[PDB]
Design a protein around this ligand. Structure first.
Ligand SMILES: [Zn+2]
Ligand SMILES: [Zn+2]
Length: 341
């Protein structure tokens, strides 16, 4: 399978300032059908004059080739670059927005709302930290962000792209973060059977005021069925908690867009095996791309959080370090979405 994708002269070909495409495009289509529908979608009366060209190009000269040979000409990456300008310090974000939102007119992959407010569409989510006591997990982090900002997914995403926290005055500074091999969003989705914490029933009530209570499943979001809700709030301390009704399916990590100095690289996943990892260096008169195997980013990946905390990030592999310490985006999807059945 991935035999035609691995080695030198493999992947998307780099050209000067191309990496912010090479990488993200490699991510979104290397081994993943998540967006293949944007590829097939017929044009409709309200599309743009270069909708079609940008579809043929992307599918025909870029995605089809990369999938079938494992290589792509930086010349085709350049044909797209041109188009972009018609509509157009470039970033993966700016890139998605323009191609998907502006040209191709893809339904926003993320549907989000806070507290009976207007529903917010978007193509990726930016998670934010705030001072906390170990090495973080995307689970934790995603959850704390949805809490602090008071949000839920209206419908579940098939594609979830998560921007990592940038700590520079505005950006350009990262931490040591754990990219959860899987993502559980049940308790973050709207109309979905949530499990009452105590008995393991069907939760009818979530309460924010409870998150800060260490004595009931510390750190977990707090939700209880009707019966377990009544007890919890007959405790003198919780008499006032303004709990509310919760209204009346796991995502897999398939790609870690990373950032080094000014240069983006990509980790993609090529099989459910823990070790099933490939590194892809874009610029690895012309550059030579390299999709190299990456079983190392797995041995470290089965190491306890506060271990990853004690270990010196500098003293670790030339793969792992990057994915752990330099993660830029992490993408997730329905486990039904790899390019292998
Ligand atoms: Zn409460
Ligand atoms: Zn209960």
């Amino acid at each position: 399978g991935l035999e035609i994708m691995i080695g030198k002269k493999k992947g998307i070909q780099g050209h000067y300032n191309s990496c912010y495409l090479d990488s993200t495009l490699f991510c979104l289509f290397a081994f993943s059908s998540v967006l293949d529908t944007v590829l097939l979608r017929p044009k409709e009366k309200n599309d743009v004059e270069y909708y079609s060209e940008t579809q043929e190009l992307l599918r025909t000269e870029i995605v089809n080739p990369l999938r079938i040979y494992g290589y792509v000409c930086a010349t085709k990456i350049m044909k797209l670059r041109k188009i972009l300008e018609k509509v157009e310090e470039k970033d993966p974000e700016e890139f998605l927005n323009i191609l998907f939102h502006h040209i191709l007119r893809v339904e926003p992959l993320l549907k989000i709302r806070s507290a009976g407010q207007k529903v917010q569409d978007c193509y990726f989510y930016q998670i934010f930290m705030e001072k906390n006591v170990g090495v973080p997990t995307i689970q934790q982090l995603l959850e704390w962000s949805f809490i602090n900002s008071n949000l839920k997914f209206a419908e579940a995403p098939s594609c979830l792209i998560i921007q990592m926290p940038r700590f520079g005055k505005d950006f350009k500074l990262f931490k040591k973060i754990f990219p959860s091999l899987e993502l559980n969003i049940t308790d973050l989705l709207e109309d979905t059977p949530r499990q009452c914490r105590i008995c393991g029933g069907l939760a009818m009530y979530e309460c924010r005021e409870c998150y800060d209570d260490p004595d009931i499943s510390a750190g977990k979001i707090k939700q209880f069925c009707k019966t377990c809700n009544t007890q919890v709030h007959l405790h003198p301390k919780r008499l006032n908690h303004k709990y509310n009704p919760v209204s009346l399916q796991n995502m897999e990590l398939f790609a870690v867009l990373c950032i080094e100095t000014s240069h983006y690289v990509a980790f993609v996943k090529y099989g459910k095996d823990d070790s099933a990892w490939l590194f892809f260096d874009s610029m690895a008169g012309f550059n030579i791309p390299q999709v190299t195997p990456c079983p190392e980013v797995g041995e470290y990946l089965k190491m306890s959080l506060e271990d990853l905390h004690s270990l010196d990030s500098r003293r670790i592999q030339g793969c792992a370090r990057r994915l752990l310490c330099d993660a830029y985006m992490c993408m997730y999807q329905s486990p039904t979405m790899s390019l292998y059945k």
